[PDB]
C-alpha cells in the first residue's frame with residue numbers, strides 16, 4: 044500500500060488558465076469588469092464665472 | 093514571484109509506466125530477465141541402483 | 142517500555158573516515174501486520190533542537206546529506222557515515238516508535254579526533 | 255518552512271502549576287497529532303505526552319502519569335500543556351514536536367520546536 | 377515533470393506489474409469522456425468538419441474520432 | 452493526476468494575466484515537439500497511414516497532422 048504524494052504542484056499546473064486574487068484580508072477580487080452609465084447632469088464646470 | 097509549489101506528487105504519475113525498485117541499501121531490482129545455458133552433463137540422479 | 146542500548150557512548154574519528162553506531166533494542170521492533178521495522182534516529186547539533194535523519198531504517202529523511210545510511214534488522218540496527226564533516230558532531234539518539242511509550246536510547250556523541 | 259515556537263517557560267517553586275503553550279505555523283494544525291518532549295541538561299531526550307488528531311485520544315508516560323494535562327486548541331493554533339505537581343527532578347528544556355508527514359507510524363517526529371526551558375527549584 | 381508525456385510505451389517491461397497499471401490504464405479515456413460530457417458543444421463542430429472533409433465514410437469517421445481525441449487532450 | 456484538465460477554455464476571462472500565461476501558452480506544443488524528437492519512427496508510420504487512407508491531398512495533410520498531434524497528446 045502506497046500513498047501517492049503531494050498534489051500541490053499538480054494543482055498549480057491544473058490551475059493554468061485561472062485568474063489569481065489576493066487573499067490577505069477577506070478577498071480583494073481583482074480582474075473584473077463592470078458596466079455603468081453616468082448621469083452626469085448635475086455637474087458644474089465651477090470655472091465659468 | 094511565486095514558487096509554484098512542490099512537484100513531488102505531480103511527477104508521481106508522470107512516472108507511471110515504469111517498474112518499481114527497492115533501493116534499500118543494496119538496490120534489489122526484482123524485475124527483468126536473464127538467459128542461461130543449462131548444460132546438464134554431470135548431474136546424475138540419486139538412488140539409481 | 143523498550144530498553145535501548147547504543148554500542149558506543151563516544152566516538153573520536155578523524156575527518157574523511159567512517160563512523161558507525163550500533164543501537165540494539167530489547168524486544169522486537171518489527172510491526173507484524175505490515176512487516177516494517179519502526180526505528181528512528183535524531184541528531185542534536187551543539188546548542189540546537191534535534192532534527193530527524195533516518196525514519197524507519199532503510200529510508201532517509203529529506204534535507205539530509207546522502208552520507209548517512211541506516212542498516213540492520215530485528216533488534217540490532219546500525220548507522221554509517223561514509224565521510225565525517227565538522228558539522229556531524231552532535232548527540233545521535235536512536236529511538237523506537239513501535240510501542241506508545243516512546244523510549245530514546247542513552248545519548249551517544251561524536252567528536253572530531 | 256514549518257515554524258514551532260514555545261512559550262510559558264519560567265522559574266517556579268515546587269507544587270505550583272504552570273501552562274506551556276506551543277504556537278505553530280506553516281501548516282494546517284488541526285489535522286495533526288502533536289507531541290511534547292523534554293530533556294534535562296546532561297541527559298537524554300525524554301518523552302512526555304501525545305494528543306492525537308482526534309482530541310479524545312491523549313496519552314502520557316509512566317513517570318508523568320496522572321500529573322500533566324495536554325490539550326490542543328485548533329482555532330488558536332496553539333498546544334497547551336498544563337503541568338501540575340512539578341518537582342525539581344521534572345525541570346528540563348521542553349520541546350514541541352510535529353508528526354511525520356511521510357511515513358506509516360501514526361506517531362513520529364518530523365520537526366522540533368525551538369525549545370523552552372522551565373526551571374524548578376526552592 | 378508535469379504529468380504529461382508519461383513513461384508508458386518506452387519498453388523495458390517485464391512480467392512484474394508496473395507502477396500504476398491499476399489506475400493509469402484508463403486515465404486518458406476517462407479524461408476524454410469527462411471533457412466530452414462537460415463540453416458537449418464541440419461535437420457539432422467536429423461533425424461539421426468531418427462532413428466537410430472526406431469524400432467517403434471511412435475517412436469521415438476517422439477524422440471525427442481524431443478530432444474528438446485531439447481536442448480534449450491537447451486542451 | 453490532476454495535472455491534466457487545465458482551466459484553459461472555460462471562457463470566464465478578464466484583462467489581467469491568468470495563473471501561468473507565458474509559461475502555459477506553449478507547454479502542450481513543446482511536449483508534442485519533444486515527443487516527436489524522441490520517437491522518430493512514428494512519423495514514418497503516420498506518413499504511411501495518411502498516404503494509404505487519404506484520398507485527396509488536403510485529407511492526407513489533415514489526417515497526418517491529427518495523428519502526429521494526438522499520439523503524444525493521447526499519451
Ligand SMILES: *[C@@H]1O[C@H](CO)[C@@H](O[C@@H]2O[C@H](CO)[C@@H](O[C@@H]3O[C@H](CO[C@@H]4O[C@H](CO)[C@@H](O)[C@H](O)[C@@H]4O)[C@@H](O)[C@H](O[C@H]4O[C@H](CO)[C@@H](O)[C@H](O)[C@@H]4O)[C@@H]3O)[C@H](O)[C@H]2NC(C)=O)[C@H](O)[C@H]1NC(C)=O
Pocket residue numbers: 142172238239240241242313314315316319360
Ligand atoms: C495503528 O497502529 C498504531 C501503531 O502504534 C497503534 O498504536 C497503538 O496505540 C496504543 C494506544 O492506544 C498503544 O497501546 C499501548 O500498549 C502498550 C503495550 O504494553 C504491553 O501490551 C499489553 C497489551 O495490552 C499491555 O496490557 C501491557 O501493559 C504490556 O506492557 C501499553 O504499555 C501502553 O500503556 C501506556 O498507556 C497507558 C495509558 O496511559 C499507561 O498507563 C501506560 O503506563 C503506558 O504509558 C498502551 O496501552 C499500542 O502499543 C500502539 N501499538 C503498538 C503496536 O505499540 C494503533 O492502535 C493502530 N490502530 C489505530 C486505529 O490507530
